[PDB]
Amino acid sequence: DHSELLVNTKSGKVMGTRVPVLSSHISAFLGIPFAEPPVGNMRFRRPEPKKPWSGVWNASTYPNNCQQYVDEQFPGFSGSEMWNPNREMSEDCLYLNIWVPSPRPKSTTVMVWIYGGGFYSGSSTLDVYNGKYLAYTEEVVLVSLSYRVGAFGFLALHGSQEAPGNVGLLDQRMALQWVHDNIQFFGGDPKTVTIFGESAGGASVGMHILSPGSRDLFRRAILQSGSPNCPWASVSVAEGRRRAVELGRNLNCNLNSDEELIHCLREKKPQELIDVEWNVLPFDSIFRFSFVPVIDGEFFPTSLESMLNSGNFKKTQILLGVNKDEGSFFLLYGAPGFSKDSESKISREDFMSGVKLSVPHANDLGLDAVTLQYTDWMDDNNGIKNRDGLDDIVGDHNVICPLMHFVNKYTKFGNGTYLYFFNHRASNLVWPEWMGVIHGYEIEFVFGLPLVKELNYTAEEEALSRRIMHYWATFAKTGNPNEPHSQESKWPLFTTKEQKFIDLNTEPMKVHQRLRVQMCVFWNQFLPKLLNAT
Amino acid sequence: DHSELLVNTKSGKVMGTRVPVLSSHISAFLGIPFAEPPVGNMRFRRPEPKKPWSGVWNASTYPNNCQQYVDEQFPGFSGSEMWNPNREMSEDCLYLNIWVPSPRPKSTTVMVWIYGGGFYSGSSTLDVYNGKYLAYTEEVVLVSLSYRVGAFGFLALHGSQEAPGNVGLLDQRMALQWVHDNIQFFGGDPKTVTIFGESAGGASVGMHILSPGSRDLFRRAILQSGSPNCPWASVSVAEGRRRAVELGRNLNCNLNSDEELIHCLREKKPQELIDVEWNVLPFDSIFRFSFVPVIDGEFFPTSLESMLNSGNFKKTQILLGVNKDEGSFFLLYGAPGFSKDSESKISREDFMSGVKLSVPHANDLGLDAVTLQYTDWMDDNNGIKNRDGLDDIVGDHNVICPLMHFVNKYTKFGNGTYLYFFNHRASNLVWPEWMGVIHGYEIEFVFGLPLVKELNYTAEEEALSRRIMHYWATFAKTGNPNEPHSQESKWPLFTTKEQKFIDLNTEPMKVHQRLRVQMCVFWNQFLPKLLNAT
Ligand SMILES: c1ccc2c(NCCCCCCCNc3c4c(nc5ccccc35)CCCC4)c3c(nc2c1)CCCC3
Ligand SMILES: c1ccc2c(NCCCCCCCNc3c4c(nc5ccccc35)CCCC4)c3c(nc2c1)CCCC3
Ligand SMILES: *[C@@H]1O[C@H](CO)[C@@H](O[C@@H]2O[C@H](CO)[C@@H](O)[C@H](O)[C@H]2NC(C)=O)[C@H](O)[C@H]1NC(C)=O
Ligand SMILES: *[C@@H]1O[C@H](CO)[C@@H](O[C@@H]2O[C@H](CO)[C@@H](O)[C@H](O)[C@H]2NC(C)=O)[C@H](O)[C@H]1NC(C)=O
Ligand SMILES: *[C@@H]1O[C@H](CO)[C@@H](O)[C@H](O)[C@H]1NC(C)=O
Ligand SMILES: *[C@@H]1O[C@H](CO)[C@@H](O)[C@H](O)[C@H]1NC(C)=O
Ligand SMILES: *[C@@H]1O[C@H](CO)[C@@H](O)[C@H](O)[C@H]1NC(C)=O
Ligand SMILES: *[C@@H]1O[C@H](CO)[C@@H](O)[C@H](O)[C@H]1NC(C)=O
């Protein structure tokens, strides 16, 4: 061995780079390969482990991002563009990044970040996912992985080994296997790996908790605004096959066999796929994504609900939560009457339109039930109430209530649950006020952006960020976000009986109980019963 | 003619009696016949007009009450016994009573009282229905009528002219015809007759508004805690026939034809019928009564809802309303966990039991919907909340929400609607506090009991009574409860757009809008849709 930036791993040697962070410096190993390029005939296939290399892999720069749909709704607007790929796209995109304190630790807590983006997009290289603040401030080794999205990751033709489904999740698993096998060389402890992620990454985290083939590869878990049972995070194998054939149909493929369909899809340029990906959804919907995880009998041995009910999952500690206005983004992008530069007060007809888009699988009685539950009939033409109503419908149904169902099912068998409600609206938010505390906007706090002066956060936002980062890292280290014997207020354990959680914001800690219970009884128990009966 | 107590009517002469009232005196003509005794072979038959008589009918004393079930739940307790027959019972019971100011007016406003009691009980002669205070204080001629209840009034074998159904309602119509024909001799104006009643009497009032054969016989209407469309106030002709045959079956009757069944029922003593009357209900229920009005194609030409929708009803002014805790009585008598001398905090299981009794025609999804609508899931074991919840369920479903549906349908075609919410709990109430403002407990205020010192009301309750009596009588006189050009606060008109109502209590008037709208959308629109689909 020779110097701090050189690490010899089981796949070969890697040379990283020294990075400044908050007046100090750490090491960064960017763009390390964890799988063979899933290109050509390996499109849609399971990933294969990266063949070891001779020489020194240069890991001074970010890798390519996976091939994906790029948002152009607000060209140049920082609010949207901060989510788009900031590197060239390529199918050659299975890489990971590691930020390591300096001096190199010996055996320290590891955190592995799994990006969101609806299973159709996302990048490990975004500015908001820069691991250097968290690695430096909390003294963790912070890994970000990547995985195939869209059809490249989730095209599913169950029965075929050429496009089985779930390959994106197997990408994530392979990176976790590599971390298990190699992170000791960077000074990480492979026995103390926390996986964490947001939205689709939060669902993904839950999915590794459930999947037998993944559970052993990590210790602990954090789920931010996402749950493995969310209504958008998986499809049946029949629905997967249906969408894959419809994809073929949109590209004039031969549909006579899997073999013909796959061969045709493998010859298309990546953009051809992405150009028609959104055409295969079965309903007029918002918060529904075309190529997502499939309940295949393999990655997931049975239905998610039967797994949760029977305790068929990894038993460990989890820390998880939701933002106050999870719905607002999806409505802005997808529902009539919502706009970025308006207050977006919603008429009764835009309301009813929005209900239908939000619960696309409901029949008419079901839509009446939703409408009744969320309408203030003493004031039914209030545009603000209609707007916020629909924001709650989308948030509750797609994020908060499936998370609460997960949390209640998990807590029965698990070894410690910590639950949060993030309701701080950042002082420098570029999105309009009506959108509130937006899906994804806790991530900048978790990654320490407010510690960076030039980004224009307040001092109280810096404090909030430091507190969150320290909850997250102390939890990853110990299974408990609270500092042993500190003076600070204690985040209590969520238990089956008392169902406690805390808010996360710049005000003194407040403990509450039974997060959105009234609505979640509707979404989790009554409505599914209504739709099954009718 | 000769003196004030002697009146010559079209049926013959009547001698009344002079009655003291509040330091003064008025005349009372008690127990005047309006139909032939509906006895023997006339049991279950339409009423026949009373044959005129020679000589002077002595009308100095109250008539017999109709044959009915007598409440013995709290023997001797004034709260219950004030509702029971206070005269001997007889099938010979079709009489009316008239209270007339002194000196005899010439042509004054007339108010005709139709008692409640679920169509199975009630009496014109109760102390709480004594018309002398209202007649004296407001200078109206106050009539109370009677009508056959239970099977005697409502046994229905559609197709037969021996027991057609609705004969009790035809009793009421015959008394109204007699008033139309004869009240001028008492100094009443037959062109200005208001019919008013409570619970089943309120439903009955609505029924005469709807029925073509009754509409012409009165001018204006007042409905207290009852609506013609209430779920307990009518049955289909198939359900009527079913219950009449089951009545036969309970009495070992021959069931081979209507002719045989009726003949057998006509030989029974009245008590035999009453002893088994409650056995014929199709469900385990509260707020459901065995022999009630039938939707026959004659009294009611079509379904009540089609009548209301098409404007097929008398167009006039109406004044109507509800009490705050309409449910409490039915729960006390009928639901587990409610008792008179306890606070009646209700367990979750007594709650679920009570929901089932309250909505006996719902399937299991429907019961889940009701449960969800009325349960505070942040506090679901609160015994007080469970108690009050069920009190609201019973009240909303059986009284307030059908009244609100009636009020909204009527107001579209009608000529002026005044709506109230009576929420004063009397200072001397003998029932427990949990029961609140009980079904029937506005009646003592409408009839002026609080003006009587010995009855132990407060001075503010006396004021309330006087205000109510004056609303009721000014409305009966003019079609508007408000005094032209007075200084007092104005009860506004309920309109389709603004849906205003007032509270009635001892505090300054408050105007509100959209009475229990949130719950009434559930009962009136969503739940019936849910039960029809499933
Ligand atoms: C986590 C991850 C990402 C986030 C995010 N990204 C921005 C979301 C990008 C919006 C594109 C939707 C159009 N979705 C589409 C797709 C296709 N075709 C389409 C064709 C027509 C219309 C829409 C289409 C094909 C490929 C798949 C997508 C944003 C937010 N939070 C996030 C939190 C908050 C607000 C702004 C955006
Ligand atoms: C308007 C009119 C009457 C009212 C009233 N009357 C008191 C209500 C009497 C309770 C009896 C129910 C049992 N109903 C029953 C019947 C039969 N059999 C039964 C057999 C078993 C059990 C019950 C039975 C046969 C005949 C029909 C009834 C009361 C109130 N408000 C009223 C307002 C308020 C509280 C106290 C009572
Ligand atoms: C998490 O699991 C640990 C250990 O498996 C639990 O700690 C045990 O608690 C039981 C009962 O209180 C004791 O009998 C054991 O001695 C404990 N084990 C150890 C090693 O401490 C702990 O209670 C679990 N935590 C939660 C929140 O369920
Ligand atoms: C009740 O009916 C009366 C009369 O039928 C209504 O008064 C009429 O109002 C219309 C339109 O404002 C006028 O053209 C008539 O001249 C009025 N008639 C009389 C004789 O006054 C009255 O508006 C109705 N009230 C309600 C509340 O609907
Ligand atoms: C590694 O490759 C990157 C690619 O841009 C380059 O910028 C850098 O100079 C290279 N460093 C070394 C040590 O080869
Ligand atoms: C911070 O604020 C300045 C001054 O208004 C502004 O010009 C700049 O764009 C902001 N910087 C960032 C990184 O948002
Ligand atoms: C009328 O009959 C009643 C019946 O009790 C009786 O009390 C009263 O004395 C009679 N009065 C006359 C004038 O006959
Ligand atoms: C009125 O109050 C008195 C004194 O306590 C009581 O004894 C009496 O029963 C009450 N009277 C009535 C009519 O309720």
Say yes or no for a CB contact (<8 Å) between A365 and B530.
yes
Reference A49, options A62, A38, A40, A58; nearest CA is: A38
- The total domain count for chain A is 1
**CA of A469 vs chain B CAs: smallest distance (Å):** 31
Question: What angle do helix axes A237-250 and A258-267 make, rounded to 10 degrees?
Answer: 50
Query: Is A498's Cβ below 8 Å from some Cβ in B?
Result: no
Calculate ∠ Cα B6-B12-B17, nearest 5°.
Answer: 30
For A4, counting Cβ atoms within 10 Å of its Cβ (0-12 exposed, 13-18 middle, 19+ buried), the class is middle
Q: Which two tokens stand for residue B350?
A: 């007594």
Is the CB of residue B22 below 6 angstroms from any atom belonging to ligand 8? no
Chain A residues inside the 8 Å CB shell of B513: 378
Reference B8, options B182, B190, B191, B225; nearest CA is: B182
If residue A255 lies in a helix (H) or strand (E), which one and from where to where? none
Q: The tokens 């699988």 sit on which residue?
A: A361
Peptide bond into A231 cis (omega under 30): no
Chain B residues inside the 8 Å CB shell of A369: 369, 526, 530
Chain A residues inside the 8 Å CB shell of B514: 377-378
Q: Tell me the backbone φ, ψ of residue A160, rounded to 5 degrees.
A: -95, 150
Site from B367, B368, B401, B497 to mutate, A interface, most A CB atoms within 10 angstroms: B368
Say yes or no for a CB contact (<8 Å) between B513 and A372.
no
> Which whole-number Å values give the CA distances from B395 to A195, B196, B277, B401, in the listed order?
53, 20, 24, 8
Name residues whose C-beta falls within 8 Å of residue B457's C-beta, 6 or more positions apart in sequence.
B426, B427, B428, B449, B450, B465
Q: Which two tokens stand for residue A138?
A: 């909390």
Helices (H), B268-363: 270-276, 304-310, 328-334, 348-358
Distance CA B367, CA B388 (A): 17
Query: Is A512's Cβ below 8 Å from some Cβ in B?
Result: no
A88 alpha carbon, distance to own chain's centre? 22
Distance CA B69, CA A198 (A): 68
Site from A367, A368, A396 to mutate, B interface, most B CB atoms within 10 angstroms: A368
For A73, counting Cβ atoms within 10 Å of its Cβ (0-12 exposed, 13-18 middle, 19+ buried), the class is exposed
Say yes or no for a CB contact (<8 Å) between B378 and A522.
no
Site from B363, B364, B365 to mutate, A interface, most A CB atoms within 10 angstroms: B365
Q: Whose CA is nearest to atom 4 of ligand 8?
A: B456
Strand partners, A35: A49
Is the CB of residue B166 less than 8 Å from the CB of residue B192?
A: no
Distance CA B193, CA A219 (A): 83
The count of other CB atoms within 10 Å of the CB of residue B106 is 9
Four-residue CA torsion sign, A438, A443, A446, A447 = negative
Give CB contacts under 8 A, 24+ apart, made by A134-137.
A134/A99, A134/A446, A134/A447, A134/A448, A134/A469, A134/A472, A134/A473, A135/A21, A135/A26, A135/A99, A135/A100, A135/A101, A136/A21, A136/A22, A136/A24, A136/A26, A136/A99, A136/A101, A137/A22, A137/A448, A137/A451, A137/A466, A137/A469
Q: Whose CA is nearest to atom 2 of ligand 7?
A: B58
The count of other CB atoms within 10 Å of the CB of residue A412 is 11
The count of other CB atoms within 10 Å of the CB of residue A181 is 16
Distance CA B337, CA B73 (A): 16
Distance CA B110, CA B87 (A): 25
Say yes or no for a CB contact (<8 Å) between A514 and B376.
no
Burial profile A327-362: b = 16 or more Cβ within 10 angstroms, e = fewer: bbbbbbebbebbebeeebbbeeebbbbbbbbbbbeb
Residue in B372, B513, B526 closest to A368 by CB = B526
Four-residue CA torsion sign, A491, A496, A498, A501 = positive
Distance CA B236, CA B240 (A): 6
Distance CA B225, CA B395 (A): 10
Reference A175, options A139, A220, A145; nearest CA is: A145
Q: Return the C-alpha torsion angle A242, A247, A252, A257, nearest 10.
A: -40
Is the CB of residue A383 less than 8 Å from the CB of residue A419?
A: no
Is the CB of residue A394 less than 8 Å from the CB of residue A409?
A: no
Is the CB of residue A96 less than 8 Å from the CB of residue A188?
A: no
Experimental resolution (Å): 2.1
Reference B191, options B220, B222, B214; nearest CA is: B220
Determination approach: X-ray
Is the CB of residue A16 less than 8 Å from the CB of residue A29?
A: yes
Site from B375, B517, B519, B531 to mutate, A interface, most A CB atoms within 10 angstroms: B517
The catalytic position among B124, B199, B344, B358 is: B199
Strand partners, B513: B500
If residue A79 lies in a helix (H) or strand (E), which one and from where to where? helix A78-81
Query: Is B483's Cβ below 8 Å from some Cβ in A?
Result: no
Interface size between A and B, measured as CB pairs under 8 A: 45
**Which residues of A are part of the catalytic machinery?**
199, 326, 439
Chain B residues inside the 8 Å CB shell of A514: 377-378
Query: Is B372's Cβ below 8 Å from some Cβ in A?
Result: yes
Distance CA B271, CA A491 (A): 70
Q: The tokens 């993944």 sit on which residue?
A: A214
The strand pair at A6-9 and A12-15 is best described as antiparallel
Q: Which residue of B has its CA nearest to A376?
A: B518
**CA of B357 vs chain A CAs: smallest distance (Å):** 21
CA B60 to centroid of ligand 8, rounded, Å? 29
Please provide the DSSP assignment of A100-135 as one string: E-SS--SSEEEEEEE--STTT---TT-GGG-THHHH
Q: Which two tokens stand for residue B14?
A: 């009547």
CA B127 to centroid of ligand 8, rounded, Å? 16
Q: What is the largest CA-CA distance in chain A?
A: 74
**CA of B492 vs chain A CAs: smallest distance (Å):** 19
Say yes or no for a CB contact (<8 Å) between B534 and A529.
no
Is the CB of residue B473 less than 8 Å from the CB of residue B138?
A: yes
CA A297 to centroid of ligand 7, rounded, Å? 93
B41 alpha carbon, distance to own chain's centre? 28
Q: Which two tokens stand for residue B162?
A: 């021996």
**CA of A138 vs chain B CAs: smallest distance (Å):** 37
Is the CB of residue A306 below 6 angstroms from any atom belonging to ligand 6? no
Chain A residues inside the 8 Å CB shell of B385: none
Q: Which two tokens stand for residue B315?
A: 């167009």
Say yes or no for a CB contact (<8 Å) between A517 and B377.
yes
The residue to mutate among B78, B130, B456, having the most atoms of ligand 8 within 8 angstroms of its beta carbon, is: B456
Say yes or no for a CB contact (<8 Å) between A518 and B365.
no
Query: Is A513's Cβ below 8 Å from some Cβ in B?
Result: yes
Chain B residues inside the 8 Å CB shell of A513: 378
Query: Is A530's Cβ below 8 Å from some Cβ in B?
Result: yes
Chain B residues inside the 8 Å CB shell of A378: 513-514, 517-518
Is the CB of residue A67 less than 8 Å from the CB of residue A91?
A: yes
Burial profile A101-138: b = 16 or more Cβ within 10 angstroms, e = fewer: bbebbeebbbbbbbbbbbbbbbbbbbeebbbbbbbbbb
CATH number at residue B40: 3.40.50.1820
Peptide bond into B103 cis (omega under 30): yes
Domain that residue A299 falls in: 1-534
Ligand nearest to the CA of A412: 3
Q: Whose CA is nearest to atom 8 of ligand 7?
A: B60
Q: Whose CA is nearest to atom 14 of ligand 5?
A: A58
**CA of A283 vs chain B CAs: smallest distance (Å):** 23
